[PDB]
Symmetry: D2
Subunit: 386 residues, 4 copies
């Protein structure tokens, strides 16, 4: 059928299948997973690799020998399975010291600690072979207006990303940063709340080339945005450094459902885009198996993430390969969208009477776009009705 | 009391108090307003100026002599009142020829016409003294996935903004462009849907300095975003070229309520930001008097736009001037947010044991932020309870 | 593939395929359709019937003799095709006299007119064979707080529906009323905004049995609610008199996409529910072909409505018939949910030590619900990957 | 300024000021509070009473004698302060045995336990003097479609509330039940998601009169609904048994901000309604002090709750008492909305030519409703600019 192999580049965070089920209104429904057991179970499922936050791999406050021992046994599981670590990140949101943020905390001593905690994990991530380092600022934001001056907070966020870029340049590390946007939760509003705000921010950093975005399906959907459209803008800007896949069923709390769940047609158009644009990075799943599930349901949800990408990849590829669909695209003039509007230049456009004075606006206005026929061919292919 | 004068820089679009009340489910409840009568009534109210779309001033399809006559009588009303025209824009969304967009229409001949219609109105706007030219692409987008290839559509949008920049540079015009973001409506999803996506886009134009954003209160609120936060990012980037003020009561269709209505606390924090950042541009109202109203209610709604800005400007200025509030800000460490995190540099931060190895995380974690006290002082000032 | 037959009970309103394309920001993209041509084209497509608002069949303001002729043509087209008229409604939202509503307008004379316009259309619907009469109070509500006292307006809404009940009872008509809820648009907030609010209101009417709901897929999704769950509560209450099918992509303006589009997994769970509950009323499509389409695009979108109901009907029937799904439902204890909690009363429950004193809370807490495996089987059936 | 007195009937749950700060992405920022210290601090602040979940007063799993002592301390603090206990509820959401719900769990033995845990707390609430018993089915629902048959789960929900009704009737207790709706979180979709759905459900119970609603400001705003409108329908139905006050800034996770924050104009219209309808139950605050605050920040936020109710009470009373507002209501025909539409029946309506044949539709269509002038007077009163 649709069996994942390492060649598909599917990756999972330690915190995803390892989530215990504690939420805002309830306690853990599952026991803690050992990182070593997660590496082996995921390898058996056909995953290509794993990612971590520092505190997922090493308990907060571990002494250096406890730290040594956690990394050592993690690395032996990696080597024994052939599993890779493509990405890593810092937890700057769980501990109560981060209750007003990490990099933009109002307290200056807490911003220095957040930067020291992050550099320590950049060194370890590079050792394990990570090529992308993610920054998700879940606690950077506010619930009230005078609590955070946002222009000065953006000065502190730029200062912190510029310091991290100076550090990896001076160490000569081959590692890139990717910002993960989220509109809200756990703060009332988070800074750089969508893909577009993170892309604009990057352009003001001292070394913009070192930074890109790591968008999450459900986060852009919490602001009611079109995730395929946000991803196309990121790819148009050359900034899609990584991507987090999951499901979300509308504007509400962050659900992190398994990929395919939530908005199924957006998942289809996202796979169509990634595959036709030739995205070559990891297909990473940041989801949380519902707390109704035991450990057998945890691996069934994680296996469903990979299966749904592969069914959808197949349906999108049959769609674009269908001659009838190719005909429908010409009918809807998707080939004329690819033509330059005025490669003849502005002066030639201004002198062209068929562009304005002799343009028949009502004949143009009457041409049907034939978009409903095209979308029902896309619907038939997704459902396997062709 | 709180009487507006031209010194307050309040401006209104011809289409706002001139809206007739036709919506998706209903016909006009009001007669058309003459542009000349709008200029005089707004001047009597204490407005500073007016803005227009080309088709508001000159009926679509007017011959050049009809065109001449409309502009001539408009300009005599302007001169007779001392009213200015700070901004102007193109209508690229009403006529059925724009049903798939203007600059990103799949049809190439329609993209050339959209660019010719826009250049014609740039010439007229500069004559009338407009310094900002707005582009609101309400029809650039899609209701379905294969209908619009978004990377090629962004190539057509960049091509069109680069052609407009070449044109005004070659004419030597002193005029800037400002992009107006909107998430959806009338398309299922619109391209560059928020302030952040428009700011990121600008950085890929050939002449980025010629372009900025013109955010609208209710549009960022349709994606559930914090409008004061979006505005602070625009000001941090030096890109707030203009601003459209109105009210919106949540994520639903675009209401364009009078400013102050909708989210009242966001309106207060927006005025606090504009006034403390020293924004010097027009305070423009793009709102629509509810269709329940007659022409007397139209001028009462428009007068309420200006009154609510002035009451709020006064409350925010009393807030920041209160010694008790200034004390509360120090208590919440808003002064330490202004201090550089590590001006001592990365190597000095890495050697600083108090930033990590000797940092007392639990003492830091226990410091209360005192943000609820600060926000209740902001609440008492807004309500005049102090 | 999958052809509609009259036995499928698919129906469409005159206003759906007849929408000309005007929206809040644009003029009509299509010509008006003649009702008799709509009846013919729909019968050729395999629909079973049509519905109408009085102003869709007879132009507002028609004399008794212009009325006569409109009605005569229409009934002639019906007779000729064998098309039925299952439901009808009144337009109490388009004309500007209804700008503050119809049954709950503040002006008493407007409330009286609204009731007289409605009774006139009830007599016509009854001779054409309609068994359901729909009420969509699209203008009942407000944009501001003191503009409507909602307790007194519910008094006027109750009085209106009680006067309609008295009237159909004294004429001995076999017609029933169905309320269509909608949360907002065109009013800032509409009265009876969801299925739940309409169901509760019905219980305070003089004759509750004459009244039920006509829920619409996209309206409950404009409040972010689960449409299948709302339908299940209406069926549990014995009040699903009719249903309106279409698609909506999230919380935003009322889109009226063709059925199947929008939230596709919710369309699958709705067809599964309607078919397993054996609902036997019409499957009515209230949608609007995108204004990007010409008339050929209209009939393609109207036929895609029916095709998507039929594909989903077949996928849901395959899901429920699969032995492995039936085993998965037993494993998630869907059979045990159907067993009464305490059929021997509360004194037998209070005496039972296994229900409290001796209940092993931690062993019960540790059972997995096996919900992700069941939902991935559901996912494989929808995509035809099973 | 504006001090709370016991006559104001302000109450708070033990869980509100006692929230320790754990959220989905972080650990507790504050220490647990002792109930007797909460009762004392709240009595000093001028509150009138406290509420509780059984697991807030007695730790889950306490023996009968640990129960004994918890209860004894608490009642001693109450006796000493004169604090009342107006309402109580059961925690059927925190413990992992409730991961698929309590009354509608798929497992029958879990449903039985849920009912036994609830009855145990009803006997205690009745001896402490509670006259309202709240049900918040936070775990009743699902993240996926086949995981819950909603018609059968409404059967189990009805059976549970009928068993509770039989029990309080056979004990002769004077307690009434109130259902708190919530649309989602922690479940993907919760059953009875809004005030309307809870009101309709009550009408199918064996003894409807024992049951009403306990609506919460932030929960109806998570569906984008108008909370004052929902409250008005509950008061119209005679079912507002209790209310929960707090703030929410839009559709997103349940924030539980202090009352006054969030949507401030909706808080103003809610106090105006509660005070003009003469609602006499408790004004209960169910909120969570932000986890950014220490314990001093907790009591500052709890006192800001009461202060904002009292300022708004005074602004609303001033709005309604102003002669000019009373003249503006007459001008918007708020008096005419209170007059019956057709008090002489439908045959007098049918005979009346002024209601249809001779009604001048265009002159009625042309009356302005004067709603913006009335809403700006409302705006001036809230801001104390009048
Ligand atoms: Mg997430
Ligand atoms: Mg707008
Ligand atoms: Mg609709
Ligand atoms: Mg809550
Ligand atoms: O996440
Ligand atoms: O707008
Ligand atoms: O609709
Ligand atoms: O809550």
């Amino acid at each position: 059928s649709y069996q994942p192999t390492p060649e598909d580049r599917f990756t999972f965070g330690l915190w995803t299948v390892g989530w215990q089920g504690r939420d805002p209104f309830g306690d853990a429904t599952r026991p803690a997973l050992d990182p070593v057991e997660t590496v082996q179970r995921l390898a058996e499922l056909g995953a290509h690799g794993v990612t971590f936050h520092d505190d997922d791999l090493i308990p907060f406050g571990s002494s250096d020998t406890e730290r040594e021992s956690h990394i050592k046994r993690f690395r032996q599981a990696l080597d024994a399975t052939g599993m890779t670590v493509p990405m890593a990140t810092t937890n700057l949101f769980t501990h109560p010291v981060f209750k007003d943020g990490g990099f933009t905390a109002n307290d200056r001593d807490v911003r220095r600690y957040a930067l020291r905690k992050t550099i320590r994990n950049i060194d370890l991530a590079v050792e394990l072979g990570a090529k992308t380092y993610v920054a998700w600022g879940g606690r950077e934001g506010a619930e009230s207006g005078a609590a955070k001056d946002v222009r000065v907070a953006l000065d502190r966020m730029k200062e912190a990303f510029d310091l991290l870029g100076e550090y990896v340049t001076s160490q000569g590390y081959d590692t890139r940063f990717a910002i993960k946007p989220k509109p809200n939760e756990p703060r009332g509003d988070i800074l750089l709340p969508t893909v577009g705000h993170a892309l604009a921010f990057i352009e003001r950093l001292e070394r913009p080339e070192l930074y890109g975005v790591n968008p999450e399906v459900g986060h852009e959907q919490m602001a009611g945005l079109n995730f395929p459209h946000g991803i196309a803008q990121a790819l148009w800007a050359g900034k899609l450094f990584h991507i987090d896949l999951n499901g979300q069923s509308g504007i509400k709390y962050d659900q992190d459902l398994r990929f395919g769940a939530g908005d199924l047609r957006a998942a289809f158009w996202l796979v169509d885009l990634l595959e036709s644009a030739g995205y070559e990075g990891p297909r990473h799943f940041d989801f949380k198996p519902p707390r109704t599930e035991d450990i057998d349901g945890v691996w069934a949800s994680a296996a469903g993430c990979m299966r749904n990408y592969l069914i959808l990849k197949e349906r999108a590829a049959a769609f674009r390969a269908d001659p009838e669909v190719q005909e429908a695209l010409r009918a809807s003039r998707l080939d004329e969208l690819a033509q330059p509007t005025a490669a003849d230049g502005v002066q030639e456009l201004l002198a062209d009477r068929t562009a304005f004075e002799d343009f028949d606006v009502d004949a143009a206005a009457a041409r049907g776009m034939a978009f409903e026929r095209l979308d029902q061919l896309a619907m038939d292919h997704l459902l396997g009705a062709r």
